[PDB]
Structure formats: structure tokens, C-alpha cells
Structure 1
Amino acid sequence: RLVIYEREAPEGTVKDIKEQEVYMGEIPLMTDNGTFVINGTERVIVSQLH
């Protein structure tokens, strides 16, 4: 939601809101067994002991 406040008010109320759906990226989905298919091959994201 791109919300536009006008210039001079003690409140800074809205002129308008332009609300819409943007596409930001694809998220690799995990399969039923805990793997990811990334560039065709199944991969495992190993947990980290830090």
C-alpha cells in the first residue's frame, strides 16, 4: 500500500492510498520429505550449530 500524505497538516493525513499486489521473488518450496528441488536436483539445507 503506497500511502501518500499531503504536505502541511499537524496530522499528515492521507491524500490517497494505491494498494496492489507486487510480485517479489519465488520462494523454493520444501517437498513432503524435507528436500528442495533447486535447478532440478534435490538438495538438503543442513541445520547449523552456531
Structure 2
Amino acid sequence: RLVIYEREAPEGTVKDIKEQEVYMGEIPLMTDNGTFVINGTERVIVSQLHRSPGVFFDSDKGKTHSSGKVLYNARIIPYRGSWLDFEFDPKDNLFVRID
């Protein structure tokens, strides 16, 4: 439904409004079972198990620096966007890195 404003009127009016059942997209339909038919070949989209978006505090268990020093780190992991990480230099500093 497309509204059209008029210019010289104050902020927010209507000249006309036109609506029309516009066609957009063909979405494949899941059959009665769970299989799609995509080009005549019957496909199945399996569920995926990924790390949940959020924030996680991990640490390599002294895998580096050979001192037994645990280098704690944090990841802010969005669902969609650019990641964010904080970590510790073996000198007990604190550095950020992006993507």
C-alpha cells in the first residue's frame, strides 16, 4: 500500500494512497514430510548446531607462553554483525581485537 504525500501541505498529509497485491518472490514449500523439491531432486535442510550469539569467556589452558600462564579471553558474538574479542598478553595486559 503506497501512500503519497503532497508538498506544500504541513509535515504529514496525504494526496493519494494506492494499494495493489504485488507479486514478490517464489518461496519453495515444504512437503507434507519435511522434504523440499528444488529441481525435481528431493532435498532436506538439516538443522544446524552453532554457538549461540552472546558473550563467552574462554581461556587457552596455558597453550602458549610456556609459563603455565592462562590467557583469559572474551568474545562478544553477535547473531549478525562484526565480532569483538578481548584477550590478555602474557604480561597481564588487556587488548581488544575486532573481526
Q: TM-score, normalised by structure 2?
A: 0.45
> How far did 1:7 drift?
1.1
Partner of 2:29: 29
> How far did 1:11 drift?
4.0
Which string of whole-angstrom CA distances, capped at 9 and with x for unpartnered residues, describes residues 1-50 of structure 1? 11001113334111010100111011100001100000111000111199
Q: How many residues align?
A: 50
> Which sections of structure 2, spanning at least 5 residues, go unmatched?
49-97
Partner of 1:12: 12
> 4+ residue stretches of structure 1 with deviation over 2 A?
8-11
Which entry has the higher C-alpha Rg, 1 or 2? 2
Tell me the distance in 2 between the aligned counterparts of 1:10 and 1:3: 16
> Which sections of structure 1, spanning at least 5 residues, go unmatched?
none
Could you say what the CA RMSD is over the residues aligned between the two structures, in angstroms?
Answer: 3.8
